[PDB]
Design an enzyme around this catalytic site. Sequence first.
Site, PDB file in Angstrom:
ATOM      1  N   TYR A  47       0.765  -1.244   0.000  1.00 46.46           N
ATOM      2  CA  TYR A  47       0.000   0.000   0.000  1.00 46.46           C
ATOM      3  C   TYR A  47       0.800   1.301   0.000  1.00 46.46           C
ATOM      4  O   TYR A  47       0.282   2.336  -0.399  1.00 46.46           O
ATOM      5  CB  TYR A  47      -0.998  -0.008   1.160  1.00 46.46           C
ATOM      6  CG  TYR A  47      -2.142  -0.962   0.935  1.00 46.46           C
ATOM      7  CD1 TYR A  47      -3.300  -0.542   0.296  1.00 46.46           C
ATOM      8  CD2 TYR A  47      -2.060  -2.288   1.343  1.00 46.46           C
ATOM      9  CE1 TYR A  47      -4.350  -1.409   0.074  1.00 46.46           C
ATOM     10  CE2 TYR A  47      -3.109  -3.169   1.126  1.00 46.46           C
ATOM     11  CZ  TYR A  47      -4.252  -2.719   0.489  1.00 46.46           C
ATOM     12  OH  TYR A  47      -5.303  -3.581   0.266  1.00 46.46           O
TER      13      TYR A  47
ATOM     14  N   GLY B  65       2.503   3.940  -1.358  1.00 43.37           N
ATOM     15  CA  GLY B  65       2.757   4.629  -2.615  1.00 43.37           C
ATOM     16  C   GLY B  65       1.901   4.029  -3.703  1.00 43.37           C
ATOM     17  O   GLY B  65       0.688   3.864  -3.548  1.00 43.37           O
TER      18      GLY B  65
ATOM     19  N   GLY C  52       0.114   1.304  -5.565  1.00 46.44           N
ATOM     20  CA  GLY C  52      -0.426   0.074  -5.030  1.00 46.44           C
ATOM     21  C   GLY C  52      -1.575   0.365  -4.103  1.00 46.44           C
ATOM     22  O   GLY C  52      -1.467   1.209  -3.221  1.00 46.44           O
TER      23      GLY C  52
ATOM     24  N   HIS D 278      -4.519   5.114   5.050  1.00 50.88           N
ATOM     25  CA  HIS D 278      -4.360   6.378   4.319  1.00 50.88           C
ATOM     26  C   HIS D 278      -5.023   6.301   2.943  1.00 50.88           C
ATOM     27  O   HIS D 278      -5.718   7.238   2.537  1.00 50.88           O
ATOM     28  CB  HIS D 278      -2.878   6.737   4.183  1.00 50.88           C
ATOM     29  CG  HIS D 278      -2.636   8.099   3.612  1.00 50.88           C
ATOM     30  ND1 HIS D 278      -2.196   8.294   2.322  1.00 50.88           N
ATOM     31  CD2 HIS D 278      -2.772   9.331   4.156  1.00 50.88           C
ATOM     32  CE1 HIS D 278      -2.064   9.589   2.096  1.00 50.88           C
ATOM     33  NE2 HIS D 278      -2.409  10.241   3.191  1.00 50.88           N
ATOM     34  N   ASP D 279      -4.814   5.194   2.224  1.00 53.14           N
ATOM     35  CA  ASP D 279      -5.430   5.003   0.907  1.00 53.14           C
ATOM     36  C   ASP D 279      -6.958   5.064   1.014  1.00 53.14           C
ATOM     37  O   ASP D 279      -7.621   5.760   0.247  1.00 53.14           O
ATOM     38  CB  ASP D 279      -5.045   3.647   0.323  1.00 53.14           C
ATOM     39  CG  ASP D 279      -3.757   3.685  -0.474  1.00 53.14           C
ATOM     40  OD1 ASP D 279      -3.000   4.674  -0.389  1.00 53.14           O
ATOM     41  OD2 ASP D 279      -3.427   2.750  -1.230  1.00 53.14           O
TER      42      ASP D 279
ATOM     43  N   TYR E  80      -8.280   8.580   1.671  1.00 58.95           N
ATOM     44  CA  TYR E  80      -8.335   9.406   0.461  1.00 58.95           C
ATOM     45  C   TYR E  80      -9.548   9.054  -0.390  1.00 58.95           C
ATOM     46  O   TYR E  80     -10.174   9.931  -0.993  1.00 58.95           O
ATOM     47  CB  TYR E  80      -7.079   9.207  -0.389  1.00 58.95           C
ATOM     48  CG  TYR E  80      -5.935  10.156  -0.096  1.00 58.95           C
ATOM     49  CD1 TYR E  80      -5.867  10.864   1.099  1.00 58.95           C
ATOM     50  CD2 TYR E  80      -4.913  10.325  -1.015  1.00 58.95           C
ATOM     51  CE1 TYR E  80      -4.809  11.732   1.360  1.00 58.95           C
ATOM     52  CE2 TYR E  80      -3.851  11.178  -0.765  1.00 58.95           C
ATOM     53  CZ  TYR E  80      -3.803  11.878   0.419  1.00 58.95           C
ATOM     54  OH  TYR E  80      -2.740  12.721   0.652  1.00 58.95           O
TER      55      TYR E  80
ATOM     56  N   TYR F 117      -3.918  22.295   1.727  1.00 57.67           N
ATOM     57  CA  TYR F 117      -4.579  22.565   2.992  1.00 57.67           C
ATOM     58  C   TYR F 117      -3.715  23.440   3.890  1.00 57.67           C
ATOM     59  O   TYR F 117      -2.596  23.802   3.530  1.00 57.67           O
ATOM     60  CB  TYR F 117      -4.974  21.262   3.701  1.00 57.67           C
ATOM     61  CG  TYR F 117      -3.884  20.206   3.739  1.00 57.67           C
ATOM     62  CD1 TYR F 117      -2.731  20.394   4.494  1.00 57.67           C
ATOM     63  CD2 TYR F 117      -4.013  19.020   3.021  1.00 57.67           C
ATOM     64  CE1 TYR F 117      -1.734  19.431   4.534  1.00 57.67           C
ATOM     65  CE2 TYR F 117      -3.024  18.046   3.057  1.00 57.67           C
ATOM     66  CZ  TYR F 117      -1.887  18.256   3.815  1.00 57.67           C
ATOM     67  OH  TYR F 117      -0.897  17.300   3.854  1.00 57.67           O
TER      68      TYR F 117
ATOM     69  N   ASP G 178      -3.708  12.758   6.017  1.00 56.64           N
ATOM     70  CA  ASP G 178      -2.252  12.900   5.969  1.00 56.64           C
ATOM     71  C   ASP G 178      -1.606  12.915   7.359  1.00 56.64           C
ATOM     72  O   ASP G 178      -0.590  12.260   7.593  1.00 56.64           O
ATOM     73  CB  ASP G 178      -1.865  14.180   5.212  1.00 56.64           C
ATOM     74  CG  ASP G 178      -2.046  14.060   3.707  1.00 56.64           C
ATOM     75  OD1 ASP G 178      -2.469  12.978   3.228  1.00 56.64           O
ATOM     76  OD2 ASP G 178      -1.795  15.007   2.917  1.00 56.64           O
TER      77      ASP G 178
HETATM   78 CA    CA Z   1      -1.244   3.294  -1.980  1.00 56.58          CA
END
Ligand code: CA
Length: 119
Positions: A27, A29, A31, A47-48, A51, A67, A93
């Site tokens: 995950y 980056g 992927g 995090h993915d 988003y 932001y 983030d």
């Molecule tokens: Ca990712």
Amino acid sequence: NIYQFKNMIQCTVPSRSWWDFADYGCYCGRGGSGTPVDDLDRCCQVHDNCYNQAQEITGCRPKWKTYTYECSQGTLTCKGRNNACAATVCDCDRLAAICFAGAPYNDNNYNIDLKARCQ
Ligand SMILES: [Ca+2]
């Protein structure tokens, strides 16, 4: 935006180049699939997903939304001047940056074969 996320990471994990988090596990980056490889990878999966939720807000583009945040004296803060989109992305983030700082980094999980190991 990604530039600010990079700075958050520099803020919370000074002892490592941010590049170390740019290609890690399934995950971190590129992927967005498979079973998370370890705790750090789980940080990135959350995090993915975060988003993906933010992008449901009209006109909200997490990679590009600028932001308002602050990084000083060991404290990462998302400011109150953010609109719904900015606030949401900043928080995704921030939580990820904090997650990275407490997770062990295993060199063997860097730059793994996504096509073969992340199904
Ligand atoms: Ca990712």
